[PDB]
Amino acid sequence: KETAAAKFERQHMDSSTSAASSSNYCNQMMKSRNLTKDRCKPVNTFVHESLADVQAVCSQKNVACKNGQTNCYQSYSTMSITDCRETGSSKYPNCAYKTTQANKHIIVACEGNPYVPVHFDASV
């Protein structure tokens, strides 16, 4: 139903803001991107850079993915990101998330043609 590339954009891209401005950002974004739909997705990272800058990571530093695959790439530069993690008290359907803003290098898994980001591996 959703292509792998479109699902990555929906779950991780937020180019409309330069950084999460309030502690409520994660509760708002996890719901509007439909990540609290049938369950509370426990962890999710939003990247605040243009889509072209994120797609460009697929041509940057090739590294292993946590799973051992080798189609992962680490951005040469740091990027504005927001980590969203369910709190100890979150309860479907009352999903509650802790928002943590940071500037780190992102690691993404790339696939296809065009070769674009399909999974968010981690940040450093």
Curated annotation (Swiss-Prot):
Cellular compartment(s): Secreted
Alphabetical GO biological process terms: defense response to Gram-positive bacterium
Described purpose of this protein according to its UniProt entry: Endonuclease that catalyzes the cleavage of RNA on the 3' side of pyrimidine nucleotides. Acts on single-stranded and double-stranded RNA.
Glycosylation sites: 1, 7, 34, 37, 41
UniProt binding sites for substrate: 7, 10, 41-45, 66, 85
Mutagenesis or variant effect for residue 12 to A: Loss of activity
Tissue-specific expression: Pancreas.
Organism superkingdom: Eukaryota
Gene Ontology annotations for the cellular component aspect, listed alphabetically: extracellular region
Disulfide bridge positions per record: 26-84, 40-95, 58-110, 65-72
Reaction it catalyzes: an [RNA] containing cytidine + H2O = an [RNA]-3'-cytidine-3'-phosphate + a 5'-hydroxy-ribonucleotide-3'-[RNA]; an [RNA] containing uridine + H2O = an [RNA]-3'-uridine-3'-phosphate + a 5'-hydroxy-ribonucleotide-3'-[RNA]
Listed EC numbers: 4.6.1.18
Annotated keywords: Disulfide bond, Endonuclease, Glycation, Glycoprotein, Hydrolase, Lyase, Nuclease, Secreted, Signal
Active site: 12 (proton acceptor), 119 (proton donor)
Family the entry assigns: Belongs to the pancreatic ribonuclease family.
Top enzyme class: lyase
GO molecular function: lyase activity; nucleic acid binding; ribonuclease A activity; RNA nuclease activity
GN (gene name): RNASE1
Protein name, entry field: Ribonuclease pancreatic
Record's subunit section: Interacts with and forms tight 1:1 complexes with RNH1. Dimerization of two such complexes may occur. Interaction with RNH1 inhibits this protein. Monomer.
